[PDB]
Every structure is written in structure tokens, then in C-alpha cells.
């Protein structure tokens, strides 16, 4: 039971971790462009 939510929230972390880094690089670019 719990481990079938863990191994799911590993894959849903390993999803969001990439979206966060790609959105962070996009934010740093648009901060440089607005300066």
C-alpha cells in the first residue's frame, strides 16, 4: 500500500523536478530580458 504511493510520488517528483528547473531557467532568462 504505502510503497505503491511512494513509487508513484517518486515518478510524480521526477516529473515536477524537471518542470521546476526548466521554469526556473525560463524565469532567469525573463528577469535578464526585463532588466
Amino acid at each position: 500500500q504505502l510503497e505503491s504511493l511512494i513509487n508513484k510520488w517518486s515518478l510524480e517528483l521526477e516529473d515536477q523536478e524537471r518542470h521546476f528547473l526548466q521554469q526556473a531557467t525560463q524565469v532567469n532568462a525573463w528577469d535578464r530580458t526585463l532588466i
Binding site: 504505502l2 504511493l5 510520488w9 510524480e12 515536477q16 518542470h19 521554469q23 525573463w30 530580458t33 526585463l34
Partner: protein
């Protein structure tokens, strides 16, 4: 067979993963073209100022 508090923190994490994903979706609906159009305008208004200055 777990402590009831760990069952509550499994529900707290199921809420938090949805809160982060809703914000990751809210970010994934922004568009740079309002800021790109500021660079479109800065080129055009520099050119129109030079025509005015030279004239």
C-alpha cells in the same frame, strides 16, 4: 498497520503534490509575447526618434 499520524501526512502529501502541480500548470500558461513586444516597441521608437533628431 501504521501510526494514524503517518496516515494523515500521506493525505497532507496528496494535497501538497496537487498544490504544486496546480502552480506548475498556472506557470505553464504565462506567455513572453508581452515582453517580446517591449523589444518590438524599443526598436521602433529608437528608429522614430532618430528620424526626429536628424530632421
Amino acid at each position: 498497520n501504521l501510526p494514524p499520524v503517518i496516515c494523515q501526512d500521506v493525505e497532507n502529501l496528496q494535497k501538497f503534490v496537487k498544490e504544486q502541480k496546480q502552480v506548475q500548470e498556472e506557470i505553464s500558461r504565462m506567455s513572453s509575447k508581452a515582453m517580446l513586444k517591449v523589444q518590438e516597441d524599443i526598436k521602433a521608437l529608437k528608429q522614430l526618434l532618430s528620424l526626429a533628431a536628424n530632421g
